[PDB]
Paper text:
Here, we biochemically and structurally characterize a two-component defense system DUF4297–HerA, demonstrating that DUF4297–HerA confers resistance against phage infection by cooperatively cleaving dsDNA and hydrolyzing ATP. DUF4297 encodes a protein containing an N-terminal DUF4297 domain (a putative PD-(D/E)xK-family nuclease) with predicted yet-to-be biochemically characterized nuclease activity and a C-terminal domain (CTD) with unknown function. HerA, widely distributed in archaea and bacteria, encodes a DNA motor protein, which can hydrolyze ATP and translocate along DNA. The enzymatic activities and anti-phage defense function of the DUF4297–HerA system are activated through supramolecular assembly.
Unexpectedly, HerA assembles into a split spiral hexamer with a cleft between the topmost and bottommost subunits. This is in remarkable contrast to previously determined structures of HerA homologs, which form a planar symmetric hexamer. The C-terminal hook docks into the surface grooves of the neighboring subunit to strengthen the HerA oligomerization; however, this interaction is disrupted between the topmost and bottommost subunits, destabilizing the hexamer formation. Interestingly, HerA alone shows extremely low ATPase activity. While the pocket created by Walk A and Walk B motifs can accommodate the ATP molecule, relocation of the R finger is needed to hydrolyze ATP because it is too far away (20 Å) from the Walker A motif with which they form the ATPase active site.
Residue numbers in the entry:
A (entry chain F): 7 to 28, 36 to 115
B (entry chain A): 7 to 569
C (entry chain B): 116 to 569
D (entry chain E): 458 to 569
The structure:
Amino acid sequence: INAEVVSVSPNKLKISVDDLEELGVGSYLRVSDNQDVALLAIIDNFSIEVKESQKQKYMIEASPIGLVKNGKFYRGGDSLALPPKKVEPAKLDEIISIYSDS
Amino acid sequence: INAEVVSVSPNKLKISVDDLEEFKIAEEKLGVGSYLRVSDNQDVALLAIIDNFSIEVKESQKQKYMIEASPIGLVKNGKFYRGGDSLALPPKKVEPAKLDEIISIYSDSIDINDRFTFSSLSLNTKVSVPVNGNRFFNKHIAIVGSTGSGKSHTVAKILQKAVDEKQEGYKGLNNSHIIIFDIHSEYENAFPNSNVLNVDTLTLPYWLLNGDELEELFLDTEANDHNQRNVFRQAITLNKKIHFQGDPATKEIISFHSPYYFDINEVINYINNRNNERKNKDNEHIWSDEEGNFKFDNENAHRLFKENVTPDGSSAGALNGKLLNFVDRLQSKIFDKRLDFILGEGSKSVTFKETLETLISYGKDKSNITILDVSGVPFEVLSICVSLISRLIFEFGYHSKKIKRKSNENQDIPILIVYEEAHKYAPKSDLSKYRTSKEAIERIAKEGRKYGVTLLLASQRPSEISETIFSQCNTFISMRLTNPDDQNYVKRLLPDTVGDITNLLPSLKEGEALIMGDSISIPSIVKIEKCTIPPSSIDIKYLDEWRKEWVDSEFDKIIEQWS
Amino acid sequence: IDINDRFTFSSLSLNTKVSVPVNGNRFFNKHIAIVGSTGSGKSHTVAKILQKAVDEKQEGYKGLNNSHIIIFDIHSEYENAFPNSNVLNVDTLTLPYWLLNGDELEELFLDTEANDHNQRNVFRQAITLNKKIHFQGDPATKEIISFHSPYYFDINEVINYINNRNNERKNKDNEHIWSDEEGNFKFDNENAHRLFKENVTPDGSSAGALNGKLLNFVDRLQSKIFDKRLDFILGEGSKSVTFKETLETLISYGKDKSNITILDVSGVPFEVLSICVSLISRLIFEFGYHSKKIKRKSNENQDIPILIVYEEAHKYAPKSDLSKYRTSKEAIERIAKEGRKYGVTLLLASQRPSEISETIFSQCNTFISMRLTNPDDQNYVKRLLPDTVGDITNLLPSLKEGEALIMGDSISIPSIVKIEKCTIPPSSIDIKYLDEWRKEWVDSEFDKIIEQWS
Amino acid sequence: GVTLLLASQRPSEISETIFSQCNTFISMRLTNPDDQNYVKRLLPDTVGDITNLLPSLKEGEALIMGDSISIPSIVKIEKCTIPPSSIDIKYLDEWRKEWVDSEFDKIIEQWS
């Protein structure tokens, strides 16, 4: 598991990750290589879980802060906008469109 | 097969799926707030809204996504009944709710003539969400949202739809009557046919202010003695009797709080003439006038209002020089150019009928929406003029119900008073300076339901509104509210909510609402329709005016205006 | 439940065939608390219980039974529910002002924020003095009479006394000399009843120290006496009404006797609503309190059990300790904490139970709870419920319309019941705003309203 | 250059913000279950079955982890030639002695 959301609360997104090496409170969760559909989430807190049977995994509480479509940013959280998940080198300047487009 | 229930709580439903991507099937938007249809047999189904998504791993099989669902009600051949049913069982088939079943949530409970459609469901834009338009307006609306959420667009769209609501038997203005108190001059752009009244054109006569509003307009609560208050209401009440041209038995009815005509310039003379009073050896205030010589008695106190009064008496009076704090205070306010709309010469000359012809817009230029632009009104008198108009509209509606009760045929003039920035006038604090507009709005809220004068609270900070006024609203259209103190105020005050949609308040999209009340069939997350003519407030473009090269030609022109 | 003791107004939600009787004796004499949010049909189960209670009769006679229900509806809902009931709005109900005690007589007339303590001292000196002259018993009982005592006084004479005390002057002997048509005298406690006449001329070349301090007092009092909204409490009809005729009107024992008396308090001004609710609640409680005195002596009790229905019970008995609702809350609290044994019980009805005070909500024993979607109303009710069965009190936001959760001593066991469908529903005649707004611009109406105002 | 050293026998009472900043964690026998759950949750690094060895540690046998050490391990600290012994009032040694009576009068004079 690279990075995948495991719980979609109305105002929260719980994402379980194996390790921090595999940022901080208030950082923007941008791992996106999809055009015209993406999800933007800020980090509420970093939490560590107790499983007693597996390796410890970091759980991040993510508040959804917006949704971008072809470079246009709309505020408010939508749960629809993460069907894909793939590991490849992606761009970084799509966080510009959060503030620059409006 | 794909989706099945795995637990049936008293309040909740646990639904486990194996593939959410197949579960969408029709490519309907699926998320928190989406409707699930849980049934194995057609034409009878339980509709459940989604609280939260989850995952589970059996450690030896494929992972399964688990959905927390709140049963909102069961449908039965086009009839929707709220509340969870007994059909929710673990051997059941769950699927996204069909278009004919979601439409039946809202369309079945409201008659075809009673539907007031101004929005559509956020998760499903194909289904429109009507409200019971009779119950929507007659019980007060509370539109709540943070800045940048397009709350003013929601207020504008509801009033634009109410004005556009019409019967096909005529073409022209309908019977919609909306009064808007905008401090930001925002709704002028929204309604091009509206009647906008600012300080330049609004003429509010001062003599309909009651005792409470007359105190705060003229005197202060910190530096005036009780003697200065006493001489004020002596002059006001005595002035209201001579100008009363009606029945002399009704002359004794008149008190300080009565809304009858008085001349403030003649009141100025009384406090001036009592400022330079002189007493005699018998403590009798003899007065010398061009008309004649007289003492200060109740039966001849009306002739003291003339400015040609010379004081008489060998010694200075007891209250001689006592009113110089008072006369100079009120002489500043009558000739203050910022109070021309309320203390000017036009306030005396205008009549009672022309005031209500202006506030309700029943004069020459009849308009459905009357916009009271209170941006130019000074903030020290803002809560007084808001209280004056809110009292003038209520007692219009209170006296509206007395005419046609006798006649037995009621034409009726329903009035909706929109309070933009509603916590400015009706606050949580019980300060005396906001006291007049608080009980005037509270009279609309607690009593105006039955007299045809209701209110719309459009505020950016709902936590500052008083609970005795905010709870009297029944339908609540909450936009994106992210402040924890405004959420905790609203979440405590909302009368009816389905599971976990209330938590969606900080994460709402722009134009996306959260509407409840007696009007709507169920609390749903709706997307308000986009305004063709948006309520864009005209404001100074500071960055544009910064890069203006410093022409400084206008300053020499400004001082001539000041002089 | 014994067969003659059953009061069936509902059947089980999960099984329509089984009826759910309650011990109707124990259901009513211990106070009810019907609670349910908007759209849950809370007004229908209040309507159905009272419709079942009115029609609950014996087979030995045909006519009215001994049901005595008083409804406080600000929303004007129950007029259509009971067509045979007595409805009293402002225009018909005539509540005398002199039946108010000391606490209600201040907030009707005065404000604590602006009135100085010496100003208020003139008010209850005038009323207490006025309450003795108009009292027509022996002079020994006149010493008992105080400000808080409920006897007849004339508010116009109190108005004159307060206005005359604004004209108090002293002579060289420092006495408040008053010149009257009957005679010339100083202000004395023996001859202070002649100060009630308006034909009193002030005397003394030097005015009093407290002279002119009561204009903020009398002008506040001037407006309320001739206020057209307060005509029902401060009009000429409140002077002419008798003590018996007020109690005849409140429980419908006049010429038109009805089981249910409906107090349409919609037209009551919101500043005096907590005073008229407190006045009627105290009048009915003291009616039941003084009902038990004779019947003990008679040795066979005929009884008038009274159930006062407080629709929107959070407005009259709120959780907030504010002095505006202090009079109505204490009058409801006296009925809750004492009216069980005097035959004056209460039915609290509210869409927001969390605003009712817990000292009054807990005094109810049987709670009928409809849909409670508001989370603070759920947490309040689940805390105050005296009974439960496992995980049925978590069913509150998922209850249907007309489906209730009823517990207490009346019922055998807490259960989710389905209240019977109200054949005559409590419809409220409210202005259909859209149905008027789709009509064309009416312009002949606005001219007529202006002539009403003048 | 001002660095600290949080030495405490009740680690769970220390606030998390202060405690987590320290990154080298030398731990002796920790046997309070609330103390163990606090430390093992606040660990920067872990090896599967060596954090559970904390209540079974010997006398002077320590668990030291952090970026300074190469790998987490269960170590034995060298025995102190001069141990940090605190001089205290030996209650049972004094209570076994005879009733001291002259010393009560001397205390009150100092107090007065």
